[PDB]
Symmetry: C4
Subunit: 196 residues, 4 copies
């Protein structure tokens, strides 16, 4: 068994690194099943030459909306769940990670089907915040997913592989995704059906 993090705390990634380089978000988000739950996923990249401490991910849905009392909220924001309640939004960023929001009754995608997706006018903002170990200062990195950039029925290609006692990242496959067999029913629709 080859360790990921060594006893002294030094990780075993990017052979020979030094732990202004920018953090990266995959250009596309994917929707697909993970153990019977439909999921939205995007990938967040590491910083090749330093750790990010007290590092956390959060996501906002920007969507103009009308309240049942006729109040129109242009570009209304609402939180997307990405591990807040279990501390799974508290990231150990030492190689690109796939973040995952389970599309459940409380998720803003609960009733969005495959066909219905392209019709929607919405934007997912992805926001990484941490303190850069080296610099000492608190960072923030942002990016955005519009409808047309969320791919229904795909999965992220794996970028991690074990080479020579070290773990190495194929950063060419970072943004890379493949298709997978995935129902086109909305999570609600899937749940309704499973419930009989």
């Amino acid at each position: 068994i080859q360790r990921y993090v060594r006893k002294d705390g030094k990780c075993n990634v990017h052979h020979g690194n030094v732990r202004a380089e920018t953090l990266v978000f995959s250009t596309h988000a994917v929707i697909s099943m993970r153990d019977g739950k439909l999921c939205l996923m995007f990938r967040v990249g590491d910083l090749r030459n330093s750790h990010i401490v007290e590092a956390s991910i959060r996501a906002k849905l920007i969507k103009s909306k009308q309240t049942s009392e006729g109040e129109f909220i242009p570009l209304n924001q609402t939180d997307i769940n990405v591990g807040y309640y279990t501390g799974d939004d508290r990231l150990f960023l030492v190689s690109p990670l796939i973040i995952s929001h389970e599309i459940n009754q409380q998720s803003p995608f609960w009733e969005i089907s495959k066909a219905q997706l392209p019709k929607e006018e919405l934007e997912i903002v992805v926001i990484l915040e941490g303190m850069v170990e080296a610099t000492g200062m608190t960072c923030q990195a942002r990016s955005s997913y519009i409808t047309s950039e969320i791919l229904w029925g795909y999965r992220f290609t794996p970028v991690l592989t074990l080479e020579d006692g070290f773990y190495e990242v194929d950063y060419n496959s970072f943004h890379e995704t493949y298709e997978t067999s995935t129902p086109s029913l909305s999570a609600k629709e899937l749940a309704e059906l499973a419930n009989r």
Copy 2:
């Protein structure tokens, strides 16, 4: 569909900005319905020339009170819910936002009607805390709503409008509110009645 935040993370607000200017709270709070829930709302302004990171909103009710055992607490504080449990108090401040506290069984306004409001002796303190991206240092901004400054049955005028691929803020309408048809029963009273 015009993006709000671009792929690189730069937002599309305040054409040609630079991302000591003060943050702003609307001078008035409003109470009115949002999808069947009575709500207290105040508006919190952005910082025209920098982001605020790890930015969060919280609110305190200052109200002198007597305990059933005759203990009098002058200016007692208690937390007003403004998205703490869902991370919706964790703000993405890139244009003035309306903050909203749903007046429910756990809210200090649960039993306050319209008529009963002006009678009350209370103060809502609004407290924004974040780290200013540029400066590096942690900010705090405060303001206050006394009874006479909470307007029953109003809504905030919209300040956001899409001009020339950019989003622009009509800051003249910032503090601006209009009236809307809103029941004058207390949330409790509304709930009691709906529950038959």
Copy 3:
């Protein structure tokens, strides 16, 4: 109605202040009823000449203990609830505040009566943490309550009074407490009895 915090965010306490002075904890803790709940309370002082931002209170019970499998833990620590779940541990420190932990089924005092208190070998550590507005740096202040310093059946004297449009703190009464009629049954005992 005289405001506590003004529109611009400046508070109306300590007429003519400047917003290394030390933060203070009352020398004694008290136990007594607040609306039918038995409560432990200690008082935490403000900083006469600056705000504390992102300010929070937490408390630890230090108590040596034996596990049912005969494992002895000298000075075991366990968290005392002082508003963590509702954000009421997130303090707006602009004048001495009484902190309050409701002694419930989950509290380490649940079964401790008045008579039984002096018998106990325990210590409450009180820990204030915030960033000092002026200095820029994160502070921590600590203090400690041993058995003999928790007073059963007392309440904290009020220190707040309204003088000349300003609110003024009688710091002589800070540590001051008076007695009040308070049952000597343990919270459990009180609950058992009330439950018939």
Copy 4:
């Protein structure tokens, strides 16, 4: 009764200290019962010559996994519960502490027996984060537990002892553990059996 923390806030540990020295994690983790619950425990060391403020512990399970839809996640991360929900991950680090994760239905060890443990291919990453009082800057310390370093049926030797009004740490016993009678059934298996 000898105090642990004095009225002024100065602790009574490491007689005559000064409050780049490294923080320490015990080289081994142990699994054993604590009041009827099976538990994983590792020990986290203090910093002999300074406090760590806003100090917190978190743990990640690194484990390559396959989703029921055949998606393979190399080195998947998932949060181990170590007091997040009760604020018990918010540490008062003034002498080595034993951290403890109760192996319950939500824990990744729920179904892992004693025999089954050595078969498993998994790694627990332990991550301490706090601000170093003196330095002013935010620290992070890491270490790692692979299968072969988690000891089933052991307990950590005590390192705390009261010498001359001061508390002293036998740092030789830090990594020291002894065996204890401990069932070899998995937590699930223990729970199933207890439930009849």
